[PDB]
Design an enzyme around this catalytic site. Structure first.
Site, PDB file in Angstrom:
ATOM      1  N   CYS A   1       0.746  -1.062   0.087  1.00  6.13           N
ATOM      2  CA  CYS A   1       0.024  -0.055   0.141  1.00  6.13           C
ATOM      3  C   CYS A   1       0.951   1.162  -0.178  1.00  6.13           C
ATOM      4  CB  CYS A   1      -0.975  -0.154   1.146  1.00  6.13           C
ATOM      5  SG  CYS A   1      -2.293   1.140   0.923  1.00  6.13           S
TER       6      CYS A   1
ATOM      7  N   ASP B   1       0.228  -5.555   1.124  1.00  8.58           N
ATOM      8  CA  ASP B   1      -1.234  -5.864   0.559  1.00  8.58           C
ATOM      9  C   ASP B   1      -1.271  -7.083  -0.083  1.00  8.58           C
ATOM     10  OD1 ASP B   1      -2.799  -3.717   1.092  1.00  8.58           O
ATOM     11  OD2 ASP B   1      -2.398  -2.710  -0.639  1.00  8.58           O
TER      12      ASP B   1
ATOM     13  N   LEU C   1      -0.456 -18.245 -22.633  1.00  9.65           N
ATOM     14  CA  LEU C   1       0.195 -17.582 -21.710  1.00  9.65           C
ATOM     15  C   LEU C   1       0.431 -18.996 -20.790  1.00  9.65           C
ATOM     16  CD1 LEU C   1       1.559 -15.282 -20.099  1.00  9.65           C
ATOM     17  CD2 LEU C   1      -0.498 -14.804 -19.025  1.00  9.65           C
ATOM     18  N   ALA C   2       1.931 -19.097 -20.507  1.00  8.75           N
ATOM     19  CA  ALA C   2       2.160 -20.043 -19.690  1.00  8.75           C
ATOM     20  C   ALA C   2       1.880 -19.842 -18.171  1.00  8.75           C
ATOM     21  CB  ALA C   2       3.925 -20.563 -19.706  1.00  8.75           C
ATOM     22  N   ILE C   3       1.364 -20.758 -17.533  1.00  8.57           N
ATOM     23  CA  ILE C   3       1.176 -20.622 -16.052  1.00  8.57           C
ATOM     24  C   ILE C   3       2.299 -19.666 -15.445  1.00  8.57           C
ATOM     25  CG2 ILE C   3       0.391 -21.737 -13.916  1.00  8.57           C
ATOM     26  CD1 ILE C   3      -1.110 -23.545 -15.659  1.00  8.57           C
ATOM     27  N   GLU C   4       3.319 -20.441 -15.479  1.00 11.32           N
ATOM     28  CA  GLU C   4       4.706 -20.206 -15.029  1.00 11.32           C
ATOM     29  C   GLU C   4       5.243 -18.616 -15.339  1.00 11.32           C
ATOM     30  OE1 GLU C   4       4.686 -22.990 -16.948  1.00 11.32           O
ATOM     31  OE2 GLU C   4       5.149 -24.572 -15.398  1.00 11.32           O
TER      32      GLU C   4
ATOM     33  N   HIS D   1      -4.485  -0.604  -5.836  1.00 11.91           N
ATOM     34  CA  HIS D   1      -5.243  -1.953  -6.531  1.00 11.91           C
ATOM     35  C   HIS D   1      -5.811  -1.329  -8.022  1.00 11.91           C
ATOM     36  CE1 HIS D   1      -4.419  -4.015  -3.042  1.00 11.91           C
ATOM     37  NE2 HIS D   1      -5.303  -3.233  -2.287  1.00 11.91           N
ATOM     38  N   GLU D   2      -6.162  -0.206  -7.929  1.00  8.70           N
ATOM     39  CA  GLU D   2      -6.662   0.451  -9.296  1.00  8.70           C
ATOM     40  C   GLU D   2      -5.573   0.343 -10.355  1.00  8.70           C
ATOM     41  OE1 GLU D   2      -9.869   2.336  -6.659  1.00  8.70           O
ATOM     42  OE2 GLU D   2      -8.095   1.116  -6.209  1.00  8.70           O
TER      43      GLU D   2
HETATM   44  C1  LIG Z   1      -3.733   0.670   0.082  1.00  8.19           C
HETATM   45  N1  LIG Z   1      -3.463  -0.186  -0.950  1.00  8.19           N
HETATM   46  C2  LIG Z   1      -4.802   1.599  -0.453  1.00  8.19           C
HETATM   47  C3  LIG Z   1      -5.247   2.181   0.886  1.00  8.19           C
HETATM   48  N2  LIG Z   1      -6.190   3.112   0.370  1.00  8.19           N
HETATM   49  C4  LIG Z   1      -6.687   2.728  -0.749  1.00  8.19           C
HETATM   50  N3  LIG Z   1      -7.679   3.322  -1.699  1.00  8.19           N
HETATM   51  C5  LIG Z   1      -7.735   2.938  -3.154  1.00  8.19           C
HETATM   52  N4  LIG Z   1      -8.698   3.387  -3.777  1.00  8.19           N
HETATM   53  N5  LIG Z   1      -6.778   1.963  -3.407  1.00  8.19           N
HETATM   54  C6  LIG Z   1      -5.905   1.191  -2.942  1.00  8.19           C
HETATM   55  O1  LIG Z   1      -5.405   0.448  -3.481  1.00  8.19           O
HETATM   56  C7  LIG Z   1      -5.609   1.616  -1.481  1.00  8.19           C
HETATM   57  C1  LIG Z   2       1.040 -28.352 -17.243  1.00 10.89           C
HETATM   58  N1  LIG Z   2       0.016 -28.792 -17.379  1.00 10.89           N
HETATM   59  C2  LIG Z   2       1.395 -26.908 -17.632  1.00 10.89           C
HETATM   60  C3  LIG Z   2       2.321 -26.065 -16.924  1.00 10.89           C
HETATM   61  N2  LIG Z   2       2.447 -24.781 -17.215  1.00 10.89           N
HETATM   62  C4  LIG Z   2       1.173 -24.594 -18.165  1.00 10.89           C
HETATM   63  N3  LIG Z   2       0.852 -23.334 -18.743  1.00 10.89           N
HETATM   64  C5  LIG Z   2      -0.241 -23.574 -19.302  1.00 10.89           C
HETATM   65  N4  LIG Z   2      -0.424 -22.179 -19.921  1.00 10.89           N
HETATM   66  N5  LIG Z   2      -0.959 -24.511 -19.304  1.00 10.89           N
HETATM   67  C6  LIG Z   2      -0.701 -25.992 -19.010  1.00 10.89           C
HETATM   68  O1  LIG Z   2      -1.408 -26.852 -19.402  1.00 10.89           O
HETATM   69  C7  LIG Z   2       0.698 -26.034 -18.314  1.00 10.89           C
END
Ligand SMILES: *C(=N)c1c[nH]c2nc(N)[nH]c(=O)c12
Ligand SMILES: *C(=N)c1c[nH]c2nc(N)[nH]c(=O)c12
Ligand SMILES: *C(=N)c1c[nH]c2nc(N)[nH]c(=O)c12
Ligand SMILES: *C(=N)c1c[nH]c2nc(N)[nH]c(=O)c12
Ligand SMILES: *C(=N)c1c[nH]c2nc(N)[nH]c(=O)c12
Ligand SMILES: *C(=N)c1c[nH]c2nc(N)[nH]c(=O)c12
Ligand SMILES: *C(=N)c1c[nH]c2nc(N)[nH]c(=O)c12
Ligand SMILES: *C(=N)c1c[nH]c2nc(N)[nH]c(=O)c12
Ligand SMILES: *C(=N)c1c[nH]c2nc(N)[nH]c(=O)c12
Ligand SMILES: *C(=N)c1c[nH]c2nc(N)[nH]c(=O)c12
Ligand code: NA
Ligand code: NA
Lengths: 104, 103, 105, 104, 104, 104, 104, 105, 104, 103
Positions: free
Chosen positions: G21, G28, G43-46, G62-63
């Protein structure tokens, strides 16, 4: 603090609250149970609710809060058994604190 | 952290990461620590940093639990400590409990 | 079998499998769960998975399976306490079987 | 009644059935579990299904049913412990009945 | 008071009623449970429903209400164990009350 | 492939399977649904179970599987709409893949 | 960036990360989702896991965080639809942020 | 059939039943649900229950049942829209069938 | 009220609160969502939280509260779309109020 | 009750009791009312008393829904009203929806 002639065996009261994390001055939201065997007197909800709001704005650890409020429950209605539980969440960590007094 | 009157019990819980020795895959897990304070309280931040210590580390779930018990015992010596670790690997749900002391 | 210099207090493993119902010869899906106390050695998950996969295509009642699998876990890591729980569903009936051996020393 | 070599420690079976309510002659829908310690024998699921199903059309209280099914399971497979539970709803009321026989 | 030859081991009945908050005269909503070990006869659902409806438009605390209903059950059917549970939600506070009697 | 007279409007089938992850050669556990509009034919559950089960031991991405099973279901029973969804978990990540063909 | 001949229709990936934050310098905790229509490659999970870990010890709202990660996904794999969802809980407040791009 | 002077907009009825799987001849438990728009008449629950009880001991696929039951509801209260949903579970497979007729006029 | 150059598509913020029921002066606990598309500015949580606590001690219908707070959301950050939802519970009745402004 | 600026939507929900005509058994049910206010708001108490009006009354679920729509329309004339009734009888779950107007 309410009289009742014939008393029940146990009472749970549960609500949400707000304190402050002393480490970083951020408001802390939490949940509080209080479980207790009455003798004669019965804590009023309005009272319990005032007792919980006493921690708005105030810096305190959740482990202090639970004990603090235990002591207050004994102040007002002085029962044998009292458990207090404070469930909160801070920095990705879920916290619970039970503060207990007396036997089951 | 220190308390005048200790609470009777405390549960901390969060998520972390290790590495599966067999397969060198990252292992995500959830972990709880339940303890009876004696004097000292475990700062949440120090708990977090204990849990973050396992990032990158090759370790069985079974050992991770036990290693974390030791750590918590070392940091604040509670008379009762219970550590629980939960993870999922190759379709198998895993819990490991590591207790030390008296309730 | 995986050697461990500090035995944790308890471990639960849980997963799905299948078998065959001897009566009707249909496939029976189930959850199984083994809970045990290690002394020295830990059941590798890969071996647990192999034990459960062993029941695929096998004709056997669920009561038999809980007990078959119990014996296996004993033979493998010989722990002082083991509890096997099988959960299943046949013809509108929810089924649980539990098998136990030893106690909390 | 199917004979295993080594008996398991515990079996629960659970399913849905119906009966008639004596008071009003309407159908009662219920959920029923039997939990039992086997000795040599194990109750076939088909046989249990037939036990529950025999109550269709039969006027009986939820309470008497719990007991009646328990007597049937002792007679069929003779376990040293049996617990039957019957759960139902009737005119805005959630009802549970347990009937047990023997030693945990 | 429905007689049965063989009593069940335990019966729970659960439902909703209302009453009135004394302090504020507000219609109070609640969930209520009776668990009891029947001796010789069971409580008719209908009777029990009546007992709980009886509190509509009555000034009573959730703590007294539990206790009263415990009394009524003991009259109607006379069990050696009775537990009554009341649950509510007044003014942001969840409330449980348990009222026991005898050994299980 | 079993032939009904009047086709239903929609069928979902859902079950669990396994595959091998190419990257690391460990087993992947997954949940898979196929939703399809029938035309004359309906996929036998036994046949679907065999479709899912054929991936055991096979190295494949969750993404390619969703597509591969979809191609199989079009080839088996030739519906004007098919949606396969594959859900899985891998190294702390919840994954869902959808593959659809044709008109809602 | 794993190539596949036949792309799936939609992919969701979901997981947890942290950041910091700005206001309070507090670590956070958050839940994060990417739903995307793959074009040619997934996209690879990794890789994705890496993207989310990248924010550990970073000052971001967060926004903004949602928006940044949307950018990254568009670079890595270039889909014609991308939605990123962030979920959190700061100071007793639940927070969701969605960040879209393109047509479905 | 129950005559009603003001037709509600929609009604759902939902309940459990059983049937027989023609393949293996075992009993198949299911949830079924009928959703319809009344015009003038309402299906008595007692009749709905009778329709579902009609499948006990009957050999029939779930896809067939959704459609059989649909036809019944049409013949009985002839509503402008009807949706029947059957939900079941066979050999580790969750099953849903939906059958529809008419539209939201 | 926080600037962000590159803005997200939607933001939900959700928390609990307390007002007063004007009919009987009892404290009323409730829950409040606010859903909004930002343009340039982004409501801060601390601010949103202050805006929600403004109703402590104050007598207002839940239908007023939702509108009132909508107007406040537009005061501070003036967005095209804004939905506000207030879920409460009074005298055995569960209440929700959506107050909306602009298009989707 | 009246509002200056009406909310866009309101849902009220609660439990009540009727009687099953066929069997003269008490029928417990849950009931929601969703409406778009125009000027007037329905006091919760008046909603309650509408719902309590059915105690003792022999009525189909199908008719109860429709009867309550009328009542709500009569009391505050919203351009859109949706009433939902849920009950359980002889093992059958029941919902009935009664709508009137435009969203
Ligand atoms: C901390 N991460 C934090 C504290 N106040 C926040 N307000 C908004 N709008 N967004 C955040 O990520 C915030
Ligand atoms: C194993 N199943 C594996 C490991 N990393 C992966 N990434 C994506 N996108 N999909 C998969 O099936 C994956
Ligand atoms: C803030 N309230 C806070 C920060 N760190 C804490 N550690 C512990 N143990 N308890 C708290 O209430 C904490
Ligand atoms: C990877 N973490 C892994 C692989 N096999 C394991 N077996 C056991 N018993 N424990 C683990 O943590 C394992
Ligand atoms: C098939 N699995 C099957 C059929 N009938 C059974 N009865 C019992 N008791 N146990 C089973 O596993 C059964
Ligand atoms: C119908 N099954 C019925 C009606 N009233 C009942 N009361 C009790 N106690 N038990 C029943 O089975 C009842
Ligand atoms: C209203 N029923 C009410 C208000 N305050 C209460 N406090 C306690 N203890 N019990 C009640 O039933 C209360
Ligand atoms: C038994 N009910 C059964 C067995 N195989 C089936 N396949 C399909 N498609 N539908 C069923 O109801 C089936
Ligand atoms: C109290 N806040 C209260 C009492 N009666 C109410 N009726 C309506 N419609 N809305 C409220 O907020 C009410
Ligand atoms: C009793 N409430 C009852 C009995 N049979 C019914 N059938 C229909 N359709 N609706 C009801 O409310 C019924
Ligand atoms: Na039961
Ligand atoms: Na799926």
């Amino acid at each position: 603090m309410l009289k009742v002639s014939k008393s029940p065996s146990l009472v749970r009261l549960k609500t949400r609250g707000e304190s402050v994390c002393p480490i970083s001055k951020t408001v802390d939201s939490f949940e509080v149970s209080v479980e207790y065997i009455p003798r004669g007197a019965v804590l009023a909800i309005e009272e319990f609710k005032k007792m919980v709001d006493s921690y708005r704005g105030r810096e305190i650890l959740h482990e202090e809060l639970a004990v603090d409020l235990l002591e207050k429950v004994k102040a007002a209605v002085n029962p044998p058994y009292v458990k207090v539980t404070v469930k909160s969440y801070y920095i990705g960590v879920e916290v619970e604190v039970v503060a207990e007094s007396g036997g089951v």
